[PDB]
Structure 1
Amino acid sequence: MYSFPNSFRFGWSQAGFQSEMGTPGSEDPNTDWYKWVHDPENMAAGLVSGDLPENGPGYWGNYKTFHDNAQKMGLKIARLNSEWSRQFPNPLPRPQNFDESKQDVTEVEINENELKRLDEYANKDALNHYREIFKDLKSRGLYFIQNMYHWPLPLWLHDPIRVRRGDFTGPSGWLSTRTVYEFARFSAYTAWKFDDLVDEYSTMNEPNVVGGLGYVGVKSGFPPGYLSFELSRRAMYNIIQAHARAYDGIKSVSKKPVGIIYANSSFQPLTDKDMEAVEMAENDNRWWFFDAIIRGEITRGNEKIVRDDLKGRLDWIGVNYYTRTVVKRTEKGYVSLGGYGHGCERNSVSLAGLPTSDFGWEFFPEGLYDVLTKYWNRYHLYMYVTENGIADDADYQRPYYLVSHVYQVHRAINSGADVRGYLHWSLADNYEWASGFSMRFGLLKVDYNTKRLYWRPSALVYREIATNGAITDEIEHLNSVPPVKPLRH
């Protein structure tokens, strides 16, 4: 039996674009993503699945049912996000005393007049519907973490198609400092209007995936899909700043804690002779972002600076984890090997014989322990495992995946890491971005035809860990690798 502190909470994570739409009159066509996925050229090139969000789970209308099932499993923490385009679907007045040609955004003026002025533009319905939803959530008794940004930018801030075509004379999302300015004002307004329901705050969700897949990994089908290393750094630089600003904006209206949710991977060395490759990958992929928003360390050009306007802008770290990444040195370089981690064949086995999910990701619970202890030992900020799950509609690997990973959180905790919760990537099946509805990550299966939810056996396993605050003795065998034998290779 593996016990967790009385204060450790078990729950789920969810996003607006992925789960909200589905119920009639729940559509939101005002985001760069809704557009990106309906684009005829994007569909013909096969960049997007062809699946439309409009036919999702239905969390905008069926949220009671979602929370009912969440209560039954005995979950005590939820992390949702507000959709920016629902509040402000129309352009806001250009914010005076703001020079777009200014590279840095060392500050933003947020005061009650400002908020009061933003209220004139905000969409009262969207605002009221959300309040109802977070209200219902709070009544059930769940701790609530609120995420400000989970990918989609409103169209007036980013037309993904124009940028894809190479046209930079339009709303260009994270490439423009305008977006940075408005994000900070948005953060504060929302904090300002929901602080009575929120418990902890998250500025954005996996900012690194937005900058990375949108401008470098163009085959993933993420917007704007314009390949450029340079522009990728521009967006990342703007994202870091948009965080510091949002952090300060929320503080201006609240004392609640504020952190960020980041996409992680455990970098494992292909050979003992690959230790340095690991260190280099973690820098390039993890440390540079957090040293920026924590130690305030960053570098324009190659000029390592230290902007005190960035220094100390994080309260907690959200840890997202799915699988590992195997790297190998290259004189000075390092590389990411295929046949391991995220680059595996679907429903088969990795080059190491570990099974792989419906998305082609390799089973590797051990990597969570590595990620949690590295963050803990380097920054000592408490953390939540804000995402962890597996695409597996049949539910063959999920029971083992769930118990094995919850086991590693427990293991990190005993090594001294302050981890306060485990939030499974998803309660129910949702829309997987470029992949569509085909990748099912939920503890509950969704009949997209009737919007009805079903309990997959692993939901009943989760109810035992949650309802017990521990990996009980009777399910302790699931803390193992799913038998590859009966599964495909």
Structure 2
Amino acid sequence: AKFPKNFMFGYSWSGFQFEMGLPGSEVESDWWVWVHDKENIASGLVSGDLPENGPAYWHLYKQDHDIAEKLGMDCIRGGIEWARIFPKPTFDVKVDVEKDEEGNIISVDVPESTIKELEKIANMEALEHYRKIYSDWKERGKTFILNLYHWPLPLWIHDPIAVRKLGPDRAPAGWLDEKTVVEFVKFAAFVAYHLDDLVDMWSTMNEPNVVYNQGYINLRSGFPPGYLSFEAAEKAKFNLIQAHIGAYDAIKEYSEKSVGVIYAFAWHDPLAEEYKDEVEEIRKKDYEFVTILHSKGKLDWIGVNYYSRLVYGAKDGHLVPLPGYGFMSERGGFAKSGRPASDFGWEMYPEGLENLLKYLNNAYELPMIITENGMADAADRYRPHYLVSHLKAVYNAMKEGADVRGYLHWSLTDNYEWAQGFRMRFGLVYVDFETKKRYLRPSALVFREIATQKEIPEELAHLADLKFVTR
């Protein structure tokens, strides 16, 4: 299975999950507070593990890029933390955000002189270290994709403990406040101004569908602010749309490079033929966020984050996602299909990635990068087959017409998995979090062999076959 010469291989990281781990890198944010909160800990909503025991990429990036480069990686999608760049309020510095009568952003203008006013109060030293990190990779002749937002927010933008104690109207409320969007636009233009020379492609945000569904409706996920409200989920979704559209406009002001989004795509499957039509409809509404963006002329590429599926059957009653399939499988065990599931209980289901890319291609006709794909698997029991099977799924989607430009694994190294803490290990490379030492997993050797030759060689082709892993 040969990939095109220019097909990119590598990995993705986020600031909150990778940066911290050694003194010097700690930063405040809504997620930092959420995860140190004693009541969140005691009610078991977050694990009690702390991100400042993480992999310390803010300090060891040079060493981690050495690993990546030696596994034949030529692309990394990285992060920049709004909470770092602007640790104080930006409200006082005004910009032009234009809206239609239904409140869609129609144009934005952060002029150069306003940029210059933001520097006065940004943490310029943080900004410089980001340059160092990104330079260190660009200098090796490689591609860098920059994603502007990967969940945490400045504390002055979102106080999730107070939104939860007091109600969103009595606290700084993040995506629930129309103003956050404007402030984010400032941030997007300020990053695009200083950083364009280091960046090949932009993403405005990562998985916004997770931020609004988990923060405001799926409460046992342990996402901030854990404030259960349909109306809030909808508000937040509406405001992320504007954050994307505004960030897109803001970026194109200071860069001519392509700008997309990175979005969490479950693949939805019906248990049997009779629910095909309903599942098709769940799918239109689950991808809806992206559809909206495409129809507004605001996506140059789409980053596909794919991990697993959901299977739908009737219970009573209604059309429901079924336990024992896809994301609802038994942790560290087997789906009802016989496929292994990850340590996270996510079924290994590469054919969902293939179905997904045919669907997205025909849906939107856009250049796509796989921006996340990987599995929680501490012992590296299944990750070799995951990796090869998902790569063979990308390849096959390409033969049927999908425009896929690279494959970015989640992830190079183990890291802090949000409300689960450190127990979910997603790395090609194990990290002992006490010593910060890195170790290769055999999947890294498989990755090295495939990426360096730009193909799944015969001798490794059998790792796409899932027969022996499935009962």
Preserved CA contact (<8 Å) 1:201 1:256: yes
Work out the CA distance in 1 between the residues paired with 2:193 and 2:329: 44
Work out the CA distance in 1 between the residues paired with 2:334 and 2:166: 39
For residue 334 of structure 1, report the CA deviation from its aligned partner: 2.7
For residue 109 of structure 1, report the CA deviation from its aligned partner: 2.7
Moved over 4 A (4+): 95-99, 101-105, 329-333
Preserved CA contact (<8 Å) 2:96 2:109: no
Match of residue 83 from structure 1: 81
Q: Output the amino acid matched with 1:117.
A: E
Preserved CA contact (<8 Å) 2:31 2:224: yes
Work out the CA distance in 2 between the residues paired with 1:331 and 1:449: 49
Preserved CA contact (<8 Å) 1:180 1:242: yes
Match of residue 359 from structure 2: 374
The Cα offsets for residues 385-404 of structure 1, whole Å up to 9 and x where unpaired, read as 00000000100100000000
For residue 107 of structure 1, report the CA deviation from its aligned partner: 4.0
Work out the CA distance in 2 between the residues paired with 1:64 and 1:292: 39
Work out the CA distance in 1 between the residues paired with 2:73 and 2:79: 18
Where 2:398 maps in the other structure, the secondary structure is helix
Q: Output the amino acid matched with 1:376.
A: N
The Cα offsets for residues 317-353 of structure 1, whole Å up to 9 and x where unpaired, read as 0000001110136899532111111111111111111
Match of residue 433 from structure 1: 418
Percent identity of equivalent pairs: 53
Match of residue 299 from structure 1: none
The Cα offsets for residues 120-161 of structure 1, whole Å up to 9 and x where unpaired, read as 111111011111111111112220000000000000000000
Match of residue 332 from structure 2: 347
Q: Output the amino acid matched with 2:73.
A: L
For residue 281 of structure 1, report the CA deviation from its aligned partner: 1.0
The Cα offsets for residues 236-265 of structure 1, whole Å up to 9 and x where unpaired, read as 000001100000000000100000000011
Work out the CA distance in 2 between the residues paired with 1:248 and 1:3: 37
Q: Structure 2 regions of 5+ residues with no counterpart?
A: none
Work out the CA distance in 2 between the residues paired with 1:355 and 1:170: 44
Match of residue 378 from structure 2: 393
Match of residue 133 from structure 2: 133
Work out the CA distance in 1 between the residues paired with 2:412 and 2:202: 20
Match of residue 5 from structure 2: 6
The structure-2 alpha-carbon separation of the partners of 1:193 and 1:482, relative to structure 1 and needing over 3 Å to count, comes to: farther
Preserved CA contact (<8 Å) 2:303 2:369: yes
Match of residue 439 from structure 2: 454
Match of residue 246 from structure 2: 245
Match of residue 37 from structure 1: 35
Matched, 1:383 2:383: no
Work out the CA distance in 1 between the residues paired with 2:40 and 2:106: 37
Q: How many residues align?
A: 468
Q: Output the amino acid matched with 1:78.
A: I
Matched, 1:69 2:56: no
Q: Structure 1 regions of 5+ residues with no counterpart?
A: 296-310
Matched, 1:273 2:271: no
The Cα offsets for residues 392-439 of structure 1, whole Å up to 9 and x where unpaired, read as 010010000000000010001111111000000000000000000010
Work out the CA distance in 1 between the residues paired with 2:155 and 2:467: 44
For residue 376 of structure 1, report the CA deviation from its aligned partner: 0.5
Work out the CA distance in 2 between the residues paired with 1:317 and 1:406: 18
Match of residue 283 from structure 1: 284
Work out the CA distance in 1 between the residues paired with 2:188 and 2:314: 41
Work out the CA distance in 2 between the residues paired with 1:428 and 1:209: 22
Preserved CA contact (<8 Å) 1:108 1:181: no
Preserved CA contact (<8 Å) 2:262 2:371: yes
Where 1:364 maps in the other structure, the secondary structure is coil
Where 2:347 maps in the other structure, the secondary structure is coil
Preserved CA contact (<8 Å) 1:110 1:249: yes
Preserved CA contact (<8 Å) 1:77 1:142: yes
Work out the CA distance in 2 between the residues paired with 1:333 and 1:256: 45
Q: Output the amino acid matched with 1:145.
A: I
Preserved CA contact (<8 Å) 1:277 1:329: no
Of 107-116 and 222-231, the range deviating more from structure 2: 107-116
Q: Output the amino acid matched with 1:367.
A: G
Where 1:267 maps in the other structure, the secondary structure is strand
**Given the two structures, how large is their TM-score scaled by the length of structure 1?**
0.93
Matched, 1:357 2:356: no
Match of residue 194 from structure 2: 193
The structure-2 alpha-carbon separation of the partners of 1:332 and 1:319, relative to structure 1 and needing over 3 Å to count, comes to: farther
Match of residue 49 from structure 2: 51
Preserved CA contact (<8 Å) 2:8 2:73: yes
Q: Output the amino acid matched with 1:82.
A: I
Matched, 1:468 2:448: no
Work out the CA distance in 2 between the residues paired with 1:249 and 1:329: 45
Match of residue 303 from structure 1: none
Work out the CA distance in 1 between the residues paired with 2:24 and 2:143: 29
Work out the CA distance in 2 between the residues paired with 1:455 and 1:290: 36
Match of residue 430 from structure 2: 445
Work out the CA distance in 1 between the residues paired with 2:363 and 2:311: 22
Preserved CA contact (<8 Å) 1:397 1:482: no
Work out the CA distance in 2 between the residues paired with 1:452 and 1:290: 39
